[PDB]
Amino acid sequence: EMEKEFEQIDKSGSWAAIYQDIRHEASDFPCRVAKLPKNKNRNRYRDVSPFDHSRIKLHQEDNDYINASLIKMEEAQRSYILTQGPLPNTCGHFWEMVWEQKSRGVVMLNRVMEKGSLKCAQYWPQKEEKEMIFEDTNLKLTLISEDIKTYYTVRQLELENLTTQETREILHFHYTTWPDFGVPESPASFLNFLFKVRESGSLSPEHGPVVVHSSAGIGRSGTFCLADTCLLLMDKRKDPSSVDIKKVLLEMRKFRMGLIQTADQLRFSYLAVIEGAKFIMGDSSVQDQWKELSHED
């Protein structure tokens, strides 16, 4: 049992060590296009870029670069598009990609201003009377509703392709209490937030990939996707004892760098998967218990 390895690891204080090892055994594919002089301003951090083999391309003959890389999971059968927090100049590309990839859900695991620093652009309207019009990519985004909770908030945006005058409802999940280089207040708060997103049909195969992100799109985003993916496997296999987190993390770092950035984030990913397993393993009554513990009211 993973719960074995976990109590074993914690006991010996091996989280930082193991983490050094995951870092050490981690893939490294080139990021040529990111580093192109021209794309310099299409990137928030000079040290976080998309492997060109997994990068997502804007369907424009102009410049198809967007710091974002499609993670495609085969066994779990799930794809996610982790991307960094759009910059002032790139919120058009962010919605262009969302439209092209056919997503139906966005997951923001960060705050626009954290510990007094700008981490991500206010890429979506906050008031229904003020829509946004992305000139460069010809899109209109508008707030339709907003369901504010304790530590998170869902929104229903309406993305309209000013070109085909086609419209789509983008649900938006926003975690607002996951600190930069931090962990969720609790496995409960996290899994509660996770399941909400699940139920909304956003993670549904019938749509494009969910666009997940934080300020850089590797730390809190890797932690969200890892827990979701492991649980996914545990379900299908129905044999939980076979899911190796380190292996699944490593499999994901093939598609995009730095997934998960702190030993404690790794450790947390174990708690989330273990806790949540309980719900996969019939204990349906656990789902509601999480909502209670999350204090999402």
Binding site: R46, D47, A216, G258
Partner: peptide, 4 residues
């Protein structure tokens, strides 16, 4: 500019 640098995150890591």
């Amino acid at each position: 500019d640098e995150y890591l």
